[PDB]
Design a protein around this ligand. Structure first.
Ligand SMILES: *[C@@H]1O[C@H](CO)[C@@H](O)[C@H](O)[C@H]1NC(C)=O
Lengths: 50, 30
């Protein structure tokens, strides 16, 4: 969707797999602020907004 | 049904696809 109507998806009750996220090299920028990309799989969160 | 007028701000939406029915509901540690 266009930037002004940016889509917001709530994510919860799932077992995430960020390994697929940072292994793929198609993503030119994978900047993570406040969290370590390597250490993400160790942490638990209440919910995610995409 | 007519249970509610409006529903919004959903957090957790789970769905499942001569007698005595007993339940015990306990809310502890969230
Ligand atoms: C939650 O409150 C209203 C009523 O559900 C909802 O329409 C609104 O989008 C939400 N606002 C906030 C600040 O969470």
């Amino acid at each position: 969707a266009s930037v002004y109507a940016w889509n917001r998806k709530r994510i919860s009750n799932c077992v995430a797999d960020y390994s697929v996220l940072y292994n793929s090299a198609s993503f030119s920028t994978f900047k993570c602020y406040g969290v370590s990309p390597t250490k993400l799989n160790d942490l638990c969160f209440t919910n995610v907004y995409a | 049904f007519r249970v509610y007028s409006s529903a919004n701000n959903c957090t957790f939406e789970y769905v499942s696809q001569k007698n005595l029915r007993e339940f015990v509901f306990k809310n502890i540690d969230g």
